Amino acid sequence: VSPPPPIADEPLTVNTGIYLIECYSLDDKAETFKVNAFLSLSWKDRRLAFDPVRSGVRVKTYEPEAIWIPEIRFVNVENARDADVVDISVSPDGTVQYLERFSARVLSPLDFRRYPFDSQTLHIYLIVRSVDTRNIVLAVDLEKVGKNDDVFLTGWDIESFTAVVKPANFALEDRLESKLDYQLRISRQYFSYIPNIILPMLFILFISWTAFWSTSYEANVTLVVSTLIAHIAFNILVETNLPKTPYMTYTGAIIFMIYLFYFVAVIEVTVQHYLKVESQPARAASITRASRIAFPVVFLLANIILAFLFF
Amino acid sequence: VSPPPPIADEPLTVNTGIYLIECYSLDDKAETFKVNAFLSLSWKDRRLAFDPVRSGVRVKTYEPEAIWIPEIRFVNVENARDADVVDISVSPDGTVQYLERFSARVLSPLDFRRYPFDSQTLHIYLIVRSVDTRNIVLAVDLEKVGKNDDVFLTGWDIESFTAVVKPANFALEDRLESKLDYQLRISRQYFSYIPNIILPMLFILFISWTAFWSTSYEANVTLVVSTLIAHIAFNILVETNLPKTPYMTYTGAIIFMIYLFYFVAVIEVTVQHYLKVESQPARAASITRASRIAFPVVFLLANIILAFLFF
Amino acid sequence: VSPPPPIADEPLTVNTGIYLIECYSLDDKAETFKVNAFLSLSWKDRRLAFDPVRSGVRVKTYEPEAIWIPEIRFVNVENARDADVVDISVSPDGTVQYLERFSARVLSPLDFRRYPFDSQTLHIYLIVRSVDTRNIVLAVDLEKVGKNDDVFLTGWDIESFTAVVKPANFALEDRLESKLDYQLRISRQYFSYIPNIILPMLFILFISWTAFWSTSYEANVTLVVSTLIAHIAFNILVETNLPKTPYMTYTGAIIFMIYLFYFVAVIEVTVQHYLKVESQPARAASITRASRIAFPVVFLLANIILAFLFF
Amino acid sequence: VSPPPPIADEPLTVNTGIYLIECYSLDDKAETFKVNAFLSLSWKDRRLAFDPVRSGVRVKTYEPEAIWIPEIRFVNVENARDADVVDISVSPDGTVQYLERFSARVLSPLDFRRYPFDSQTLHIYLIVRSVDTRNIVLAVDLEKVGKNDDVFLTGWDIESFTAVVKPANFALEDRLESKLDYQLRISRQYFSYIPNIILPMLFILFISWTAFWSTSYEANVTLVVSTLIAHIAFNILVETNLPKTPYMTYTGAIIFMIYLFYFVAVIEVTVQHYLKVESQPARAASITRASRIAFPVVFLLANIILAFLFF
Amino acid sequence: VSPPPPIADEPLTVNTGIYLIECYSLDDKAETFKVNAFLSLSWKDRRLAFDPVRSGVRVKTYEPEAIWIPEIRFVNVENARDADVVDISVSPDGTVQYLERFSARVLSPLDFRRYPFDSQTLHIYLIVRSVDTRNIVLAVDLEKVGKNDDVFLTGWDIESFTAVVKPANFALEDRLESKLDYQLRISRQYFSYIPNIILPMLFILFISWTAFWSTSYEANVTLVVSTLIAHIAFNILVETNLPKTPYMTYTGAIIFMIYLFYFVAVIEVTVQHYLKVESQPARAASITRASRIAFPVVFLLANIILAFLFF
Ligand SMILES: [Cl-]
Ligand SMILES: [Cl-]
Ligand SMILES: [Cl-]
């Protein structure tokens, strides 16, 4: 075959809809996710039209390579989609109803600034290249767009699956291409991170601060440096969950700022000990007593400085 | 082709059965598992019926694309099934017997609340979309549903493979779809976890508690902080076996509660030492002697508080 | 096509043979292994028989989908086999010679009780489903079963590749199925494990025992707890080589028993120190001197208790 | 089919262009990256030419296996490309316009000398083998070469995608082959590495240096050796991001040089302690006080020695 | 089709050549590597021969399934090769020129005795099975065997790609098979390993030896045991780069021998301390002073004992 000829000089509207049956494998590091969904297309090809009265049953089915079907292709995917054709129904008036079920690996970027309290807007871009004999445009059949009540993306809640109704079209290598935008919004399930990363990472920090109620370098070094080792256990665990962002993550800031509250603690401790060899135990254990508040304070300030700075 | 015409105005019962030949790769983190099984279908298409007497042999075989075969598709899979067709036998009266062997990667969620003492109900959902010319319904051929005596899902015992006989059917994008539910129940083999995770994780905790029979900060810090390091070895090992649940796991609770019995131990130790610089060795080593029971008690209580809270 | 009609009322013998060209990727954790082998089949279909004298060359070749070929399928595989057809030769008398080379991922379980001193019996099960018009049986063409002198399964020696000549056949969903059993026996190359896991894991234990010739808690805690950290390095390395068995592995026992000889060492040390604060340096360093033999003894006993218990 | 016959004795120019739709998965260790792009070809086959006036619409479409299409193949790929054919338009004068969209895994080496401040020149080599009946040459259709404003290669900025216009051609196994060179230049997003690797790796080093303001071996050993442990945490993390280069990386130098500033620190410390048993506390704590500047100096020198040496 | 009939009673020589376009992914652990190469075949089938003077152009091209092409198959591969056919040219005299480009994952074992200073001989074995009607033999077209100036196998230098000209042929399941042997020799790029594994692993050892210039058990235990921890960091990193060999690696020996120079160091230290409690500070610090040379000596001896033993 080859396309429907234009009765006027109009371009052909093709009526698209994506209905999600599964979302799975949101891979943060990779900035991807797998989807499994119906893709539903719908266009007018009068060449196929017919008389219901004489022909018998209302609507006519075709095997795929019988009729002309538009080159609808996903933009932002790695795996060029794996699809079964489900039904092709042609209505009396030459209007076609195409349905495939597909699954593909989509490549939408994620913004980690607010990790692990972030939300995202995933993107499934649909395209169609316009042929020789006529232009083609896509548009949204808002009733053939949805998702399942099953659909669970482990570690995220799912807000909306909507579609930007207006396809911005444009010239790509001499011909026109029409591009739609489907939008899956999600919010990270942050609960996990409290008792798995934050509360522990804090306890091991707080332990470090017990060297303010001690005056034994021999022991304080152990206190602070050992807990720094323990903290390092949890920096290398968090920084490889995520990709190398060229912008600062919020968790990453918190974590990096902690590397001072160890560094500076060592300084205080190293000083308190210094002065006590230099015999000013008054001035030494002024500092050390100060710290007992300075540290918890400057922390609760500076986490609130950051909190605001990031939200 | 195209479907059997409805003699009355009835829908079309299709007679389904899944017989498991292999279950494997239950992936906890992914919330998936691979299955390899016969799918057996069975429907009435009178167009194919015949006279055995004037025939040859009793029953007639067809190559797949010869006859009309219903669009039976798995719902909750990532890999749209890999299938070889095994036999299509048509009985004299137009009743078809379809058999394929398939294997697919199924995506059923697991509830980790009781890990690693949990059990699960896996789900293989079968669907069929209803065509223009008539509706289609599924139902269970209870004699064509089973599993092998071979079948072993490493790290789980397998209870039942049954099927919810009544398919709840419903409207999806204008047409009807009929959905069955096959149910594989399993229970985790928890033995591994005793001598691999729990008993060790306890010994390293108990060691921490030897700092109640000591009065040497210089050493006690080492005792408690080192064992905390060792414990951290086993938190990062358990917390990446599993997915990030937004609900509290039972193992996760135990583990998180342990991070206090290190934190609080440090407090006690830090205090006992504090008081000894402030000269109340009586009051100091009252506490220290108390702890010798307080800790083991509050633990056996609070593990039994949790145990109950989770079971 | 459809099968050879039975001249008597006999079932059809199909003459099977597997010749291994490669075994590779024995995956302990997965309980699998990849094989790459000739599958050779051989049956009598008189419909194909012919006159050599008049027809020309002695034996006739056919492209696969020309003749009737039996549905031979592997039972215990994940990847339903990838096969090239190599030759189909039909002898004058209607006897067919089928040869494919295949490769597949086989799923045979392994028994780890004796790891890493274990041996295994891998299993490649061949099946054939019996048709409508006649029954089918498999049997072994003992001269078409072997393996290469190349074949190396890294980390295992390979004993035998034999086949249980008698196929136990049986009824599966109304029809007969005939199942053969091919058996690849292997023994683990345990040498690696001596200087990589056992000898080191022992040295770090023996170091722990230097705290019996010391009377400095400050230091002994360090000695024992540090070496316990080092030992933990090698428990988490061994326990993820293997799958979670619900039965006790021999290596796992040894390892778990070691977690006492650290625990109990801490006890002794914690005691020796205790008594020295309570002023019985005699009784304290009686124990400590006892231990110097108690420990190495109770170890050589209890590894020999286990050794016998497991062999 | 078979090629266009040469009107003169000229070779055939084929007009190539690659338009990148996605770059992703730059795998440093593997020295690869996945691309997804239009490949656009364009040649003159007069056999296909026609009269527009009589034939109807201006330009003629063909299904792929209808016409002769040149054997264009990618050189430096692992996955021999996955391609859909998009359009084949033949202009009146026998000039063909071929368009496929492809995606492939490209194998271009990366130079890590300046990691993680490096830039790279990726390479997509296009080839065509020349046939019996005539020679074939490639050349660049500079207007059909570009990339998207979407295209993001996580962790890199993308400079240019250009093409070396002149294909160097040559004899390979008796016949000619013509090879083009497309060039994707990129620069690593180094920001991530400051607060994730460098600043921490420095703090843990600076802590080591607090043992110059201390005179307690018992503690200094702890200070220096513990921080060396912490540093080892970050050497094994960096050295497995990257491949085993046979040339010195810049990060690797820095890191390896740090292993001296621990080694030499131990020496100083071990000495200061030695002398203090030998009773020259003057000479001992001359050294120690010297070091307080020697170390930070020799570091700022030697990082600047290297910095220059590498840039 | 079916083969060329033998004019005499000779077997058919088939003229093979492999030209490497890419080698990549030498996987030490797996004992594999991916190759991407031309396979070029060449045989005499007179049935295809012709008269150039009357037929027109010198040489005739055929689509693959037109002519008889020999069953050439790779022996030692996991992935049964992925191939495009490039050209089939038939010369006037019935001699065929076949060319495919293929890529496959080859399974050649590597000998790790001398790791990481080893070299290897990779193996790509070509086979052909001999038919009913006549025998087939392979042989090398030495001018159609080579490699690219591009070809880079990251972490190895590439010496030669040659072919054992004489195919040893043999009987496999009743018929003859002819097997060629192509040989890719490579040498490991060992530079990486000096500043990444050996020099550090030595510094951490040398630090251990600073406990000979100290007489503080409290501290020496820390010195030696901590550095043993640090060394363990680098044993578990080296021992999982490589497969479990049943023979001793050279790196593995060095590493295992190091586990004594920690063990024995502990002994010395544990002794020096013992004697100081038993009051022979002379005899104690005789040993300690001896060691200061004993250790570095016995090391430079015993690494040279081994060096020789392995080379
Ligand atoms: Cl697509
Ligand atoms: Cl499906
Ligand atoms: Cl290609």
Numbering used by the authors:
A (entry chain E), B (entry chain A), C (entry chain B), D (entry chain D), E (entry chain C): 5 to 315
Sentences from the study reporting this entry:
Fast synaptic transmission throughout the central and peripheral nervous system is mediated by pentameric ligand-gated ion channels (pLGICs), also referred to as Cys-loop receptors. The binding of a neurotransmitter initiates a cascade of protein motions that lead to transitions between resting, open, and desensitized conformations. Here, we show in electrophysiological recordings that desensitization in GLIC, a prokaryotic pH-gated pLGIC, is enhanced in the presence of DHA. GLIC has previously been crystallized in its resting (closed) and putative open states, however, the desensitized state of the channel has been structurally elusive.
To better understand the mechanism of DHA action and to attempt trapping GLIC in a desensitized conformation, co-crystals of GLIC were grown in the presence of 50 μM of DHA under acidic conditions, similar to those previously reported for GLIC wt. (A) A side-view of the GLIC-pH4-DHA structure at pH 4.0 solved to 3.25 Å resolution with a bound DHA molecule shown in stick representation. Well-defined electron density was found for DHA in all the subunits in a pocket at the channel periphery; lined by M4, the M2-M3 linker, and the β6-β7 loop. The DHA molecule appears bent with a twisted/curled orientation, and makes a salt-bridge interaction with an arginine sidechain (Arg118) in the β6-β7 loop. However, it must be noted that the density for the DHA tail is not resolved beyond C13, and therefore was not built in the model. The R118A mutant showed robust pH-induced currents in oocytes, however in comparison to GLIC wt, the current decay was much less affected by 50 μM DHA. In this new M2 conformation, the pore is funnel-shaped with the hydrophobic extracellular-end (Ala13′ to Thr20′) wide-open to a pore radius greater than 5 Å, reminiscent of the GLIC-pH4 structure, while the polar intracellular-half (between Ile9′ and Thr2′) is constricted to 2.5 Å, resembling the GLIC-pH7 closed structure. In contrast, in the GLIC-pH4-DHA structure, while the extracellular end remains open, the intracellular-half of M2 (lined by Ile9′, Ser 6′, and Thr2′) undergoes constriction, with the largest effect seen at Ile9′ (pore radii ~2.5 Å). In contrast, the GLIC-pH4-DHA structure shows a distinctly different hydration profile at the intracellular half of the pore, with loss of densities for water and ions. We therefore suggest that the GLIC-pH4-DHA structure represents a desensitized conformation (perhaps a lipid-induced, deeper state), where ion permeation is occluded in the intracellular-end of M2 below the 9′ position.
